[PDB]
Design an enzyme around this catalytic site. Sequence first.
Site, short mmCIF file in Angstrom:
data_model
loop_
_atom_site.label_atom_id
_atom_site.label_comp_id
_atom_site.label_asym_id
_atom_site.label_seq_id
_atom_site.Cartn_x
_atom_site.Cartn_y
_atom_site.Cartn_z
N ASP A 112 27.00 -3.02 -5.44
CA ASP A 112 27.37 -2.30 -6.66
C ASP A 112 28.60 -1.43 -6.12
O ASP A 112 29.39 -1.29 -7.35
CB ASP A 112 26.05 -1.27 -6.67
CG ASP A 112 26.55 -0.54 -7.86
OD1 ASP A 112 26.45 -1.02 -9.13
OD2 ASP A 112 26.50 0.89 -8.02
N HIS A 127 0.78 -1.13 -0.01
CA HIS A 127 -0.04 0.09 0.03
C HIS A 127 0.80 1.38 0.07
O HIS A 127 1.63 1.35 0.82
CB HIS A 127 -0.95 0.16 1.45
CG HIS A 127 -1.78 -1.07 1.17
ND1 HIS A 127 -1.70 -2.34 1.63
CD2 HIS A 127 -3.24 -1.23 1.13
CE1 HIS A 127 -2.63 -3.08 1.72
NE2 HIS A 127 -3.59 -2.33 1.49
#
Lengths: 147, 147, 147, 148, 146, 148
Positions: free
Chosen positions: E117, E66
């Site tokens: 990363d 939500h």
Amino acid sequence: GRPRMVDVTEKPETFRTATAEAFVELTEEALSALEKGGVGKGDPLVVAQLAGILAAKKTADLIPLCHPLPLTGVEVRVELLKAEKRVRIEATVKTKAETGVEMEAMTACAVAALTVYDMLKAASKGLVISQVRLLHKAGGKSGEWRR
Amino acid sequence: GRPRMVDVTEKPETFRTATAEAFVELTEEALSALEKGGVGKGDPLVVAQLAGILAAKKTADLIPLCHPLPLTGVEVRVELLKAEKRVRIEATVKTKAETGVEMEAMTACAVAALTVYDMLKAASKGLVISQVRLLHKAGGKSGEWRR
Amino acid sequence: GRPRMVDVTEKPETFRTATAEAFVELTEEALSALEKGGVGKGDPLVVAQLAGILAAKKTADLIPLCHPLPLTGVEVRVELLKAEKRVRIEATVKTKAETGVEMEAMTACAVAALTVYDMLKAASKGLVISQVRLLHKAGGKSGEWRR
Amino acid sequence: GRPRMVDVTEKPETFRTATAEAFVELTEEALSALEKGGVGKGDPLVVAQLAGILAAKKTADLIPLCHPLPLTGVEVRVELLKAEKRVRIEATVKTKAETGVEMEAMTACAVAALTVYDMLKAASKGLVISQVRLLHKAGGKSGEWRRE
Amino acid sequence: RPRMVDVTEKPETFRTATAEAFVELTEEALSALEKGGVGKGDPLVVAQLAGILAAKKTADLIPLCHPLPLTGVEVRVELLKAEKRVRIEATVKTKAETGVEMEAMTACAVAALTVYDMLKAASKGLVISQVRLLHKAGGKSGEWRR
Amino acid sequence: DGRPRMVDVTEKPETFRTATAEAFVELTEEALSALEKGGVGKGDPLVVAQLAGILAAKKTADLIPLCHPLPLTGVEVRVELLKAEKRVRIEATVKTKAETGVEMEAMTACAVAALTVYDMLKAASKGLVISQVRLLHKAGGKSGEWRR
């Protein structure tokens, strides 16, 4: 001293509003191109005005620590001030929340200005966004603020 | 007058580069806060620098008629010019494409500036962003360009 | 069976184009409002036309298995067919890739139609987006289809 | 006719609901592929149903003047009407806000339909998305509304 | 079938959640980290900000989640040198009809992915060992802790 | 420097890249039981998670600050229940033709698929753990093949 989205959990949701403005300095070759309808990409002011409204909604996605908020109102005005060879942009954002919408108003103005630049870039690469600044704010603890 | 996303399918693919800059003029209160690490939201310069890089990537999403392009390089510098009481932001974007990256550079600087504002907003709402302008660009039909 | 983004890594890159259209059926109340300038939210056609261009760029984010790819050209046309009480939208998208751009053209038309509905629903909630269909596509092994 | 996101700041927050539907008309080849499980990309109806829910949440990002609002419920149904050679999509969205969610319901249906198209166009490029329309809404000043 | 559970009639209440994640480092990745990274910048600083951004992007990443107005987000990314491990913790807060466990988990997971990363150039074998919830409160079921 | 930057790869060649990662979600008895019944009422956990993974691969650049945005040419995601082990295994292989690898896209696909499994089952157990998101293989780039 690390980054954080300020905790505003215990603050009540109140009517909030903020208004900012920005200006784009026009060269002669950009002013004449603007009066004739642009450089072939469409009406510079029309595209920029809508780009401002969209930007207001995308503010939380652009400003890292900005709070995601439901917006109840957004107005954007992009007008040509011929005497000054300047394009004036104004934006007002409103909401009912625990934190202000100054970033939304400022962002709407900055992106609308960037869009005016994009729409006249062909005629003049040296166009300058001059000031982006808050004009008004109201709603929070500190109440009303006027530039 | 109708908006168009200039067709560049029939265009030369070349190495493109664009460099822009922007400034945030500080009040004494903001300067002081900055030198102390911020207003409690985190390091203003560090968060803004990262915001600039993220903005470069989101350019096509913010500027209506901008072409979605793969970016091969993005450098952003956000520095405090103490004596001048202002923060200077510079951004350079590179790519190999059929269209330039001036908007990515301009957008990177504008959003970094807006982030500096968000990070010091608590000290002074009157901080001003200005002089968002292109400094250099090359690779287009118009060739090399420098302010 | 299982959802997947089709592997097109080893496919030769070729010119790709696609054109689609969509219609929005209007009531007399919506038509009347359109001719007067809208319902107070602004020009329905102008806003929808830009929404379409923006939607073409956002296609991969809306269609799960759609391939993300840089677009080199996006054209969107929104026209009022008055006597028919219809708004017609047409969009053509171009690029150079290993897959087609049918979705980008279809999506651009659909969202533009949805925006027309948003800009006029205050006049009539019963407005209908009658059809969204492809008209042309070329590129790849299997090109050249037209309705 | 200057564009603007209608100011609804002082309007009270209320329970809102909206239901819309859309159809994708199939060719014999699309119908056949659909019944075989798709064109090799996966189940068209399953992927489309999920795409519709996601679309509802992305509505404000796609429709310029729509108000960003917190959705509290999203239901999407995507079914094959074999005899009619048609796929029917229905979506009901709900929220607690100052403005209705008709756009979210309409967008959910439209995008679900687009996804059905994407999942079967390898078999037929001629598939048509038709009748994206509102069926019901309630919660605001205007009150109840239903397509009759 | 998938659905965004209807919470329209649930009351708005203070809700909070805390999660954590770890990234196991190789000697080469640790060495690179101690020297400022692999040339892309400070791994921990970029990862910490990525976590906050991720919290805000949760509903867009988790299909049936939500969309809700977040009132607070805190993320901490620390290097545990001897252990050759980077620990990430995140606490999210809100006033809504549903909890923010997903926001806390997503913030930790994305911050961990960013650490990867920022150092994968040194070692491709870095592992995000685990992501788990540590605490949550505010709902019908009240308080929970590992 | 130690300051962030999107590494300059403007002069590098555009080559075929591939990457494969995996992730696991350790289940409790209640979660395992819920899974076999088809979830907790929000829908099929494994089905929703699998799609979430594909969508996540595409949103990688939007989630990882310094990642280069590039056109993905292929995405495969598998989400399976390993009953005897009391855990869900996720594997994802991503492909592209670019100047940088897709290890991030594969890792993110697995991580988000895992987070989605958690979301689809947390109603049964909040203690579910996402364990071991790791790279298994990658090819392309100057460094060549690499395998766990």
